[PDB]
RNA sequence: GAGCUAGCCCUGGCCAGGGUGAAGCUGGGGUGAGACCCAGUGGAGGCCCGAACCGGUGGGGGAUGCAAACCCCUCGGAUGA
RNA sequence: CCCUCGCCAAGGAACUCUGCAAGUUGGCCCCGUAACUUCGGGAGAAGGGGUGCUCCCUGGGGUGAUGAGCCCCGGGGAGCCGCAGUGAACAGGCUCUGGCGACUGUUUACCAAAAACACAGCUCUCUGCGAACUCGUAAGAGGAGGUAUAGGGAGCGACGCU
RNA sequence: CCUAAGGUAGCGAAAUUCCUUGUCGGGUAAGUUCCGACCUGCACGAAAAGCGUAACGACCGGAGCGCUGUCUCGGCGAGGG
RNA sequence: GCUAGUUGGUGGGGUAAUGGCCCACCAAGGCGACGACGGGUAGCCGGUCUGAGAGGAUGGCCGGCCACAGGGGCACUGAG
RNA sequence: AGCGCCGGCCAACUCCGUGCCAGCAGCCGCGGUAAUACGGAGGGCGCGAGCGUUACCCGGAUUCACUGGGCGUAAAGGGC
RNA sequence: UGGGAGAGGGUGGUGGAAUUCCCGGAGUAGCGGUGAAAUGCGCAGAUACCGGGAGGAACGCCGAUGGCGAAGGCAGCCACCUGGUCCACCCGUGACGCUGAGGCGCGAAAGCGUGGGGAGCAAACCGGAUUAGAUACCCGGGUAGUCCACGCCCUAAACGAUGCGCGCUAGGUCUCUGGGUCUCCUGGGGGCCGAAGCUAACGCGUUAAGCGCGCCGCCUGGGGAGUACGGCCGCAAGGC
RNA sequence: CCGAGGGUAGGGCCCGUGACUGGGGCGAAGUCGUAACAAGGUAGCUGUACCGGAAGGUGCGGCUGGAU
C-alpha cells in the first residue's frame, strides 16, 4: 500500500511514499556491499553522454546474485528482506546452510523464514530457480537468464514478471513483461513468481526536491532552446514544431523505429510488443 | 463449521443445571459463539454482505435476551456478559 | 586555458533564536467488530518569522567613482532543488 | 546649489506614467477574526485591549535533602509618576477586486527575475538488452553492474471538468 | 457552390479587438484605465492544450481606508561638500 | 443545537419579601426532537361569530388583567 | 319609493335593436341577422328606506376526516 | 436434538462449445449484407475446409406456470468459508413480544477515481442505404464501456405500481420441498379458479384488495416542479 | 462602578432594486418537422450515459402500463 500523506505543504498534498512493509532488516550486508561510484552521466572522456543526470543520495551496491545456477541443490533461508536503493524490487537475504551468503532480487510473497533452492529437481514454488525447462508452461516467472550462464537479464523490475507459453525444440517461449513473444533458450534459469513490490509505479514524487533526491536533474524542453541547440529551438514567442518532432540529435521521435533490422536476435523473436 | 462437541462443551458451560439447554444464558452464550465465528469470516470475506445480515439479526437476538436478563436479574447479566467478555 | 564562470565527481564544513504542530503512539469514547471523534504525547515539512550565510526587488547616491558593477535605505531565500 | 538627515500651520495623493519616494504599521501577552477552501489553510486576516515602577498576599518547577540559599514559570490585591512605560535601539501599513503563472525553486556575472526556464503530474513514441540512445576514427565508455513498475526522445505542465 | 473536413464544449472588445474611448451596467463630481456584461471573435478555442481553481508571488492591472513635505507651497534647522 | 451570571453552591448587598434580583469567591454545571435557540405573527380572558355537534374563526363595543404615555434611560416624593 | 334580478344553479318571458360587434360573467357559459343569456322596452319575480356590490370570517367542505377520509389501477407503501 | 431442499453469499481452482486474431496446410472468384442494395472485405488469394496456437467473455442441453434471497438480484463443475429457511421430536427458557421517527448497512444499470484486462458487443463517432429530408430505424466500421480489484455514486416501471406482525372467514385444481398410519393425511412455499365479503369498476379473494388490533411510511386539484432558494451529501455527474 | 446612547471595526438574517441572463405560464391568426395515443407506422415507458435544429435518438440495464 502506497502512503499518503496530508497537505500540510503544498508538495505533501501529492506526495506518497512506499510502504517498506516486506521490510525486516534495516542495513545491508556488510560483504554483501561495494561502493557504486556515481557517473554524472559521463563517460570516461568527462562527457555527459546521458543528458540531466547527477547529484543524487550516496548509495551502496548491493551485490546480486543473478546466476543461481551456481549453487544447484544447496537450499537457503530467507533471513531477511532490505531495501535495495540501486532497483525498485527490494532484495532478500538468503542465508544458505553451506554457510554462504547471497542477496536476491525478492519475489512477491517470499516469507522470511522460509526456504529456496535451485536446480532441474527444485520445487515450482516461489523463490526457487530452475532451467526453464523444467518449469511447468503456464508458470510467471521472473530473474529470466537470456542465454545460459550468462546472468539473468529478464523481469528484474518491481512488479513485473514473464510467463512461460509454450516450447519448441531446445526453447521455450516466454511472454516479457512488454508483451512481447520471444524464444529463451530451454537451459536458461528463472525462479518462480513475480518480482515483488508491485506498488512502485504508484508512487507519486510530489515535488522537484525528490527527482532531485533520485539524481534526476531538470530536464529542458527543445521548444525553450535555441535554433543552436536543438530542432524545436527558437521562433519568436511560443512556437509548434515546425517539423517532425525531433530529438536534440535531429532524428525524428514520434513513431521512427530505431531497432536494428538485420539483427541476430530476430530470428528469436516471435511478436513484437504490444500497445 | 461450529462442531457439535464444541456446542455442547457451550451448552453445558453455561447451562444453570444439568438438562439446561435454551435457558437464556445458554441462548447468549449460543449466540456468541456464532456471532464471534461470522465477525471473523467477515474479516476476511468483506465482501460478503449477504451474511453479513445475518450477523445483524444475531447481534440483534442476542442483544434482547440480554436486555430481558438484565431486566430479570442484574448478577446474572453482568457475569454473563462478564463470562464471554462481550459489552462495549 | 574550467585558479573566473557553468555542470558533475570525491572528501569535509556550515545553517542564532523563535513559531506552526503531520503521521504515529497512549488513553478515553464508539461499534458486533469497525470506521471514526476527543485528549495527551509526539516532532513531520522544497512549513512560518528572523541573524549568520546566499541573494539582488524598488528607490536614492555614485558616474574622469571608494568601485571597469560600489554605497545607503528597502527587499527575496534562509533543513533545502 | 547638491548630498544624507530632523521638524512643520491648514489640507491630505489635490503630486505623478505610478503614492515613485517618504509617512503610517511595527516586539511580546491577551481578546478577537470573513468570503472562499484542495479542510492544511486563508491567519499576524481584520480590529482591539495590555505593557513602567512600589508594596502586600499567593501557586508550580529546577538545584538542594524533603529545608535554606540560588535560579526558572506564574496568579491575585492595593498604589505611585509622566505627554508618553517593547518610554532609547532592533521589529508588518491594511483591505477589496482582476490578469498571468499551481505551488518552493531557476535565469540574461555587469540595463530584463518575469507571464520566461524548471517543477511534481499527463500523453505519444522508441527500446528484449552486446537495448535504444550519446561521446569516440577506433578501442573503450556512459546508459547500467540497470532490464519495460526500466532506460531514451518529444510535447504538455499541481489539481478539477474536459 | 466549394472542400480533405468546414471550429464542438467552453470562452470572447481578451497579455488576442483593426474600426475603438464599441455598447450597456458598476465604481468617481468627473473614469481612453478597472470590474460586470453583450457578441459582426479585423485576427479565441481544446496537451505550441480549452475553461476554471484554494494557496502561493519583491510579477502586471483597478479601487478603498490608514498616513504622509508626493503636492497646494514652501519654510526653518543639522552635518558632509 | 443553545448557555459564562450561564446552572448550583458560600458569604454579603438589596427589598415589604423570596430569588443570579445585584456582587465576591468556589464548583461545572443548566437547556433541547415532549422542539431549546432562532425567525415570523399576536396584547390574553370573560366573551363573539359560525357550526347539528365536534370544531373552526375571532378578541370591536362592555367587564377582568396586562402593557404603554413622542423614542430611550433614571430615580425622587410617597402607604402606593 | 327605491334597488337587485327574470339562460341553469334560482322565483320571475315577450317585442324591438345589435350581429363573435357592442357587451354580460360567481361557475357552466351567452353574442357569427328570429339571443328568454348583450342594450332598451312591456311584462314578471324578490325584497322595501332600503336594495345591491366589494372585502373578510364560519358554513355547505367527511375537501386535514376526533366526531368523520384515504394509499393495485384515481393523489398516496419508504428500494430492501 | 435429529434431519432437509435450494442459481442464497464470499474465496480459490477448473471444464467444454462458440466468436475473434495469429501460424501451417489445401483451394479460387467471389464473400458479406438487406425488403432490395450499397458501403465494406477479396487475385497483395478473401469466403467455405482441415491442423496448430493465443485471449477474453458467457455458461447450451438439464430449464420449468421450477428454486433461493429482505430487496437489488442469483445459473457450467469442484472444494473451503458462511447466511437465511423448512420439517420432525414436543426436551429446555418463561411474554424474553410487534412495529419502528432518527441512526447504520445493503442497494440493477449507467456513471466516476486508481490500476489491470479487452475476444464478442457497442453510446459517441465515420460511412452506406432508406427517405421529400433521415443528425434515426436497417447495413459496414468503431472508442468509452461492458470484464477483474479496490474506493465512490445511491437512482429506477428498485413493481405485486400492494409496509410489517398477529388473529379470524368455503372449497376445487396444478406444483416445489418436508414429515406421516405414505390410498390418503399433515406442514412450509409457488401458481390458477373460486365461498362469504370487498370494490367506482376492472378486479381481489387463507399468498385478501375480506373481517379486525398494533405500529410505521405516505396523499389532499392539474400545471409550474421534483424546478428555485437554503441546507446536507458527492471527485464529478448528480443525490436527498 | 454600572449606565441612555454616541463612535470605531468585523460579522449574521431579511426586503427592495440591477446591465445582462435562464427557463416558465399564457396568447395566437405563424415557421419547421411529427415524438406520444392504433403494432401510431422503429411497441412504449424507464434510471443513466453520450449525442442531435426540434420534438427526440442510440447504448446499457429494467417494467408491461405491449399490439400480432
Ligand atoms: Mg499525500
Ligand atoms: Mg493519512
Ligand atoms: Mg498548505
Ligand atoms: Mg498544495
Ligand atoms: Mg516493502
Ligand atoms: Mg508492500
Ligand atoms: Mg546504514
Ligand atoms: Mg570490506
Ligand atoms: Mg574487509
Ligand atoms: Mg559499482
Ligand atoms: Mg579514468
Ligand atoms: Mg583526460
Ligand atoms: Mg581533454
Ligand atoms: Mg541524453
Ligand atoms: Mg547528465
Ligand atoms: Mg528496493
Ligand atoms: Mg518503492
Ligand atoms: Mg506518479
Ligand atoms: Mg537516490
Ligand atoms: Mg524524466
Ligand atoms: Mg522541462
Ligand atoms: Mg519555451
Ligand atoms: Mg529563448
Ligand atoms: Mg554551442
Ligand atoms: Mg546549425
Ligand atoms: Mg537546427
Ligand atoms: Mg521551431
Ligand atoms: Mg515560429
Ligand atoms: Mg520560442
Ligand atoms: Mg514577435
Ligand atoms: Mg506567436
Ligand atoms: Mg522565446
Ligand atoms: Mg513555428
Ligand atoms: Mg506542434
Ligand atoms: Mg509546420
Ligand atoms: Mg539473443
Ligand atoms: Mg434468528
Ligand atoms: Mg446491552
Ligand atoms: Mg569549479
Ligand atoms: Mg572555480
Ligand atoms: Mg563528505
Ligand atoms: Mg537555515
Ligand atoms: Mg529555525
Ligand atoms: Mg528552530
Ligand atoms: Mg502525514
Ligand atoms: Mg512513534
Ligand atoms: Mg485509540
Ligand atoms: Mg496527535
Ligand atoms: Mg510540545
Ligand atoms: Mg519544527
Ligand atoms: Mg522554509
Ligand atoms: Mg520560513
Ligand atoms: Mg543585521
Ligand atoms: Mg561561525
Ligand atoms: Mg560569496
Ligand atoms: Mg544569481
Ligand atoms: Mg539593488
Ligand atoms: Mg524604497
Ligand atoms: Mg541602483
Ligand atoms: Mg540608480
Ligand atoms: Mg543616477
Ligand atoms: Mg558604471
Ligand atoms: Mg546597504
Ligand atoms: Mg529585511
Ligand atoms: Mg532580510
Ligand atoms: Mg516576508
Ligand atoms: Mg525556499
Ligand atoms: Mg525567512
Ligand atoms: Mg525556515
Ligand atoms: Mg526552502
Ligand atoms: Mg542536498
Ligand atoms: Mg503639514
Ligand atoms: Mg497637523
Ligand atoms: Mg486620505
Ligand atoms: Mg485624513
Ligand atoms: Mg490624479
Ligand atoms: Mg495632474
Ligand atoms: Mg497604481
Ligand atoms: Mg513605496
Ligand atoms: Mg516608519
Ligand atoms: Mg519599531
Ligand atoms: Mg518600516
Ligand atoms: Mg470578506
Ligand atoms: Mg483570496
Ligand atoms: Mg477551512
Ligand atoms: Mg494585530
Ligand atoms: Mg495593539
Ligand atoms: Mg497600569
Ligand atoms: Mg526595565
Ligand atoms: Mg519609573
Ligand atoms: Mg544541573
Ligand atoms: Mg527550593
Ligand atoms: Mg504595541
Ligand atoms: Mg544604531
Ligand atoms: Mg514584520
Ligand atoms: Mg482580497
Ligand atoms: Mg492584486
Ligand atoms: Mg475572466
Ligand atoms: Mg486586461
Ligand atoms: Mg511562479
Ligand atoms: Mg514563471
Ligand atoms: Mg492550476
Ligand atoms: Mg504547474
Ligand atoms: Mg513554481
Ligand atoms: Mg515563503
Ligand atoms: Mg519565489
Ligand atoms: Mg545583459
Ligand atoms: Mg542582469
Ligand atoms: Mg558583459
Ligand atoms: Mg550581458
Ligand atoms: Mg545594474
Ligand atoms: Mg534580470
Ligand atoms: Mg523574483
Ligand atoms: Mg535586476
Ligand atoms: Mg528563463
Ligand atoms: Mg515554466
Ligand atoms: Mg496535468
Ligand atoms: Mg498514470
Ligand atoms: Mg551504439
Ligand atoms: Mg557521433
Ligand atoms: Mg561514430
Ligand atoms: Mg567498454
Ligand atoms: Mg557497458
Ligand atoms: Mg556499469
Ligand atoms: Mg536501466
Ligand atoms: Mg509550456
Ligand atoms: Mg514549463
Ligand atoms: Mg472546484
Ligand atoms: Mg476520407
Ligand atoms: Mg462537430
Ligand atoms: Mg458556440
Ligand atoms: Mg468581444
Ligand atoms: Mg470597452
Ligand atoms: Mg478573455
Ligand atoms: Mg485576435
Ligand atoms: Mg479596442
Ligand atoms: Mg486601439
Ligand atoms: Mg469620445
Ligand atoms: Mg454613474
Ligand atoms: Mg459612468
Ligand atoms: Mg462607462
Ligand atoms: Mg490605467
Ligand atoms: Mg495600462
Ligand atoms: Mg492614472
Ligand atoms: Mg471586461
Ligand atoms: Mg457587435
Ligand atoms: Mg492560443
Ligand atoms: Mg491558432
Ligand atoms: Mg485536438
Ligand atoms: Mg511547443
Ligand atoms: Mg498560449
Ligand atoms: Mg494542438
Ligand atoms: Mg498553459
Ligand atoms: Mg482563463
Ligand atoms: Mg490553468
Ligand atoms: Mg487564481
Ligand atoms: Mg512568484
Ligand atoms: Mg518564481
Ligand atoms: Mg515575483
Ligand atoms: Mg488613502
Ligand atoms: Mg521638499
Ligand atoms: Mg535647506
Ligand atoms: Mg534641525
Ligand atoms: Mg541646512
Ligand atoms: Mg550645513
Ligand atoms: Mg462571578
Ligand atoms: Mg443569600
Ligand atoms: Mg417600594
Ligand atoms: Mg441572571
Ligand atoms: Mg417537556
Ligand atoms: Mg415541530
Ligand atoms: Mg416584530
Ligand atoms: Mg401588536
Ligand atoms: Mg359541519
Ligand atoms: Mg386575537
Ligand atoms: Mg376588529
Ligand atoms: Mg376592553
Ligand atoms: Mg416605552
Ligand atoms: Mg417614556
Ligand atoms: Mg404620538
Ligand atoms: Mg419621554
Ligand atoms: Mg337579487
Ligand atoms: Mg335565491
Ligand atoms: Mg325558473
Ligand atoms: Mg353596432
Ligand atoms: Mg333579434
Ligand atoms: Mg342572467
Ligand atoms: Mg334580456
Ligand atoms: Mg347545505
Ligand atoms: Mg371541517
Ligand atoms: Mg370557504
Ligand atoms: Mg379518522
Ligand atoms: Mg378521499
Ligand atoms: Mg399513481
Ligand atoms: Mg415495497
Ligand atoms: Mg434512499
Ligand atoms: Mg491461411
Ligand atoms: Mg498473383
Ligand atoms: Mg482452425
Ligand atoms: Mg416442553
Ligand atoms: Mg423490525
Ligand atoms: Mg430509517
Ligand atoms: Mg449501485
Ligand atoms: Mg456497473
Ligand atoms: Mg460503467
Ligand atoms: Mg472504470
Ligand atoms: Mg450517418
Ligand atoms: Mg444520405
Ligand atoms: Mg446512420
Ligand atoms: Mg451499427
Ligand atoms: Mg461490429
Ligand atoms: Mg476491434
Ligand atoms: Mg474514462
Ligand atoms: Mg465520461
Ligand atoms: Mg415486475
Ligand atoms: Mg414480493
Ligand atoms: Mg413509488
Ligand atoms: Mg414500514
Ligand atoms: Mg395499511
Ligand atoms: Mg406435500
Ligand atoms: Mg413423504
Ligand atoms: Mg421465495
Ligand atoms: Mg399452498
Ligand atoms: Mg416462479
Ligand atoms: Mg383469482
Ligand atoms: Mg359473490
Ligand atoms: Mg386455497
Ligand atoms: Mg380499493
Ligand atoms: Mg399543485
Ligand atoms: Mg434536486
Ligand atoms: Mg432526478
Ligand atoms: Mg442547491
Ligand atoms: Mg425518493
Ligand atoms: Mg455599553
Ligand atoms: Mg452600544
Ligand atoms: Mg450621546
Ligand atoms: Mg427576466
Ligand atoms: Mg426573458
Ligand atoms: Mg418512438
Ligand atoms: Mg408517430
Ligand atoms: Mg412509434
Ligand atoms: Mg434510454
Ligand atoms: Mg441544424
Ligand atoms: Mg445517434
Ligand atoms: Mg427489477
Not at chain 1, 497537505?7 to 561495494?34: C, G, H, N, Q, W
Not at chain 1, 527490494?90 to 536446480?119: F, M, N, S, T
Request: with cysteine; charged share 30%.
Amino acid at each position: 500500500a502506497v502512503k499518503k500523506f496530508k497537505p500540510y505543504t503544498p508538495s505533501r498534498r501529492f506526495m506518497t511514499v512506499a510502504d517498506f512493509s516486506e521490510i525486516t532488516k534495516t542495513e545491508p550486508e556488510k560483504s554483501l556491499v561495494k561502493p557504486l561510484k556515481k557517473t554524472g552521466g559521463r563517460n570516461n572522456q568527462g562527457r555527459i553522454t546521458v543528458r540531466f543526470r547527477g547529484g543524487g543520495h550516496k548509495r551502496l551496491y548491493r551485490i546480486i546474485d543473478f546466476k543461481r545456477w551456481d549453487k544447484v541443490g544447496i537450499p537457503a533461508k530467507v533471513a531477511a528482506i532490505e531495501y535495495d536503493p540501486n532497483r525498485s524490487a527490494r532484495i532478500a537475504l538468503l542465508h544458505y546452510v553451506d554457510g554462504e551468503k547471497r542477496y536476491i532480487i525478492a519475489p512477491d510473497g517470499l516469507q522470511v523464514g522460509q526456504q529456496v533452492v535451485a536446480g532441474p529437481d527444485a520445487p515450482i514454488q516461489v523463490g526457487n530457480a530452475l532451467p526453464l525447462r523444467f518449469i511447468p508452461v503456464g508458470t510467471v516467472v521472473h530473474a529470466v537468464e537470456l542465454e545460459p550462464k550468462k546472468g539473468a537479464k529478464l523481469a528484474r523490475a518491481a512488479g513485473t514478471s514473464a510467463q512461460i507459453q509454450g516450447r519448441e525444440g531446445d526453447y521455450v517461449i516466454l511472454r516479457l513483461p512488454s508483451g512481447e513473444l520471444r524464444k529463451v533458450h530451454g537451459e536458461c534459469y528463472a525462479t518462480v513468481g513475480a518480482v515483488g513490490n508491485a506498488d512502485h509505479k504508484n508512487i507519486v514524487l510530489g515535488k522537484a526536491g525528490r527527482s532531485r533526491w533520485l539524481g534526476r536533474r531538470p530536464h529542458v524542453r527543445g521548444a525553450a532552446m535555441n535554433p543552436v541547440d536543438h530542432p524545436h529551438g527558437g521562433g519568436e514567442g511560443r512556437a509548434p514544431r515546425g517539423r517532425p518532432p525531433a530529438s536534440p540529435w535531429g532524428w525524428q521521435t514520434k513513431g521512427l523505429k530505431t531497432r536494428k533490422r538485420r539483427k541476430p536476435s530476430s530470428r528469436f523473436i516471435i511478436a513484437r510488443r504490444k500497445k | 463449521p461450529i462442531t457439535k462437541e464444541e456446542k455442547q462443551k457451550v451448552i453445558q458451560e453455561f447451562a444453570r443445571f444439568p438438562g439446561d439447554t435454551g435457558s437464556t444464558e445458554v441462548q447468549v452464550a449460543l449466540l456468541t459463539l456464532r456471532i464471534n465465528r461470522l465477525s471473523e469470516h467477515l474479516k476476511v470475506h468483506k465482501k460478503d454482505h449477504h451474511s453479513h445480515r445475518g450477523l445483524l439479526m444475531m447481534v440483534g437476538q442476542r442483544r434482547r435476551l440480554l436486555r430481558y436478563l438484565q431486566r430479570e436479574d442484574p448478577e446474572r447479566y453482568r457475569a454473563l456478559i462478564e463470562k464471554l467478555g462481550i459489552r462495549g
